[PDB]
Amino acid sequence: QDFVAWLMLADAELGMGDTTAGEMAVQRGLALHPGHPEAVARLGRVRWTQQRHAEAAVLLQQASDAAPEHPGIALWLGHALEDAGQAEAAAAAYTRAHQLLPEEPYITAQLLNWRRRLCDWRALDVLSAQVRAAVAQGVGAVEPFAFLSEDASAAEQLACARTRAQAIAASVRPLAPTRVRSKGPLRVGFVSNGFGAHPTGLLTVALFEALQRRQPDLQMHLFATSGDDGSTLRTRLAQASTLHDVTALGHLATAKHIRHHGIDLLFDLRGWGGGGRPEVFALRPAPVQVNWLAYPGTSGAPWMDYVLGDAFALPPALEPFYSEHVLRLQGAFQPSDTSRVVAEPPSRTQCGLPEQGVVLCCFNNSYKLNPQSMARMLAVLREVPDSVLWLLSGPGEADARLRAFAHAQGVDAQRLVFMPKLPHPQYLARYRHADLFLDTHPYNAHTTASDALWTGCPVLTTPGETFAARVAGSLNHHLGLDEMNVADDAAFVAKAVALASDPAALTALHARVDVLRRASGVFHMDGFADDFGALLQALARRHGWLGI
Numbered sequence: 001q002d003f004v005a006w007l008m009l010a011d012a013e014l015g016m017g018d019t020t021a022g023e024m025a026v027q028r029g030l031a032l033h034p035g036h037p038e039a040v041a042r043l044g045r046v047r048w049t050q051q052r053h054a055e056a057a058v059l060l061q062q063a064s065d066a067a068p069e070h071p072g073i074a075l076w077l078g079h080a081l082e083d084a085g086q087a088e089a090a091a092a093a094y095t096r097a098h099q100l101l102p103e104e105p106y107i108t109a110q111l112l113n114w115r116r117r118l119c120d121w122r123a124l125d126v127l128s129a130q131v132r133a134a135v136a137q138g139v140g141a142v143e144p145f146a147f148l149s150e151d152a153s154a155a156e157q158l159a160c161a162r163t164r165a166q167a168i169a170a171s172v173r174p175l176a177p178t179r180v181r182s183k184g185p186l187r188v189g190f191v192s193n194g195f196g197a198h199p200t201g202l203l204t205v206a207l208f209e210a211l212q213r214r215q216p217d218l219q220m221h222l223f224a225t226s227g228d229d230g231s232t233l234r235t236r237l238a239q240a241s242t243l244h245d246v247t248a249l250g251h252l253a254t255a256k257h258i259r260h261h262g263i264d265l266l267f268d269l270r271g272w273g274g275g276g277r278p279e280v281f282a283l284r285p286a287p288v289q290v291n292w293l294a295y296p297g298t299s300g301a302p303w304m305d306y307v308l309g310d311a312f313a314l315p316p317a318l319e320p321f322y323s324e325h326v327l328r329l330q331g332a333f334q335p336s337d338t339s340r341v342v343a344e345p346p347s348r349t350q351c352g353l354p355e356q357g358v359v360l361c362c363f364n365n366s367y368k369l370n371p372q373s374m375a376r377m378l379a380v381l382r383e384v385p386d387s388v389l390w391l392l393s394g395p396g397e398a399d400a401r402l403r404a405f406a407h408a409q410g411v412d413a414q415r416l417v418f419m420p421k422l423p424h425p426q427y428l429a430r431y432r433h434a435d436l437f438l439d440t441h442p443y444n445a446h447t448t449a450s451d452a453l454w455t456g457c458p459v460l461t462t463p464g465e466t467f468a469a470r471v472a473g474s475l476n477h478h479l480g481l482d483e484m485n486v487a488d489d490a491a492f493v494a495k496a497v498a499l500a501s502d503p504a505a506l507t508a509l510h511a512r513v514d515v516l517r518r519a520s521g522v523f524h525m526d527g528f529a530d531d532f533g534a535l536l537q538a539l540a541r542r543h544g545w546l547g548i
């Protein structure tokens, strides 16, 4: 009935879902102390869960100014500003929070991830080390998907995944166990928040179309954790399966809904990313659970039975670093939308390129563009006189930093061209102007590598020692382009330099990409469906399914 109780009751009704049970309380905190950093910040915090981000930043910014020593606040300010699309000021707040809590791993991880996204490489080495050590000591505050950006072995990655999983598993009682059906068509489920204009939808669409057509004994179920975005993918995907909208259903309710349909094999296409909902899988709604295609590494999770990769991106040499039993498709692990008619792009000038000159490009998100990957790309521009680096536009002053670094490396900043965000059909068209795609290490082009190749642009890569660092390589290998996989950085530059400065050889290579594009099984979704569908049937029998 008075007073820190007030703000208290707000702190866990709110992050327990029920927010106006919550609201009613802060507003009464304000009742006792009118505008008080600890209270203010909290109004602020409702707004945020209430999706009213814009209001939040202003409130939080007032509190912060009155309490520039308060790190709880600094963190909430950052969250807000971030979700109010103020990238650079969001990192500012995260920085101050870190100043104020050096040992707090959660905060260190946050700031490392946010800095990579802005290519702010200040003290990166230290930050990276810290974050890895936090994984190492099993206090992994570290979010596994962000963790993919660090130069960590498959061992550390497994450590980081199993840490998080085990925390989730402890906080949760599974559903009563069940078993794969003996008789009758196989119910195969896929959960994701990518069923629309997102990588996941974009890679699986033509696959599921093919499955509907070719594997009529497999009953496909898609469990959409995101609403309809009005894209052709969402429609196409809803056309090729039974698509359940489970958006804004609780973890529990979703599992219960998955169970209600008797799914036999449930694929997680989420994965440890945003919009995840791992706690959904922890409830074991299905008797056999599989990790595939969405998160490029191990789940760590004991609720995860299998992982699906391929002989290249998940070689036997890597098997021990996955908690799942490993399964493999007959070619690349990644499917793609081979219905895509690549449009003609607007001319070079309209795309902001010069007319003459070799155009190298890399369209990965900013967090993949790390010191090592950039240096090596710029290393190519130096030796090739004419040439040009085409990149995606990133948030905040990321582009500015890259320019400054380019100059810091001894390259005219005018030589990097920044494509803004374009809807898929128009973006994809931009590849016809690119001469060579320059991959990133340790976090490869995934979907984009596939995009690039589909339009006929070759991808140069350095297959590393983890799954995420071998995705570009798996495509090149399964395409038959083994000379696009090079041993190391020096070989990369050497190879790309040789290519760029020899237009003759370069054109031969585009030509060769084309043949393989249509010849190999990598881009032959019918074949992919057959393989996939057959692997599913076997897996089920190995669990008790008696077909028919």
Ligand SMILES: CC(=O)N[C@H]1[C@@H](O)[C@H](O)[C@@H](CO)O[C@@H]1SP(=O)(O)OP(=O)(O)OC[C@H]1O[C@@H](n2ccc(=O)[nH]c2=O)[C@H](O)[C@@H]1O
Pocket: 197, 198, 199, 202, 363, 364, 365, 392, 420, 421, 422, 423, 424, 427, 445, 446, 447, 448, 451
């Ligand atoms: C950054 C982040 O936390 N999440 C996401 C992602 O979840 C999100 O849905 C996506 C926006 O749809 O941005 C990030 S891509 P990720 O790193 O996760 O994987 P990627 O293979 O990099 O995916 C490249 C995607 O962008 C497409 N893309 C890109 C640029 C453009 O201008 N147009 C476009 O369609 C490209 O065709 C492909 O569809």
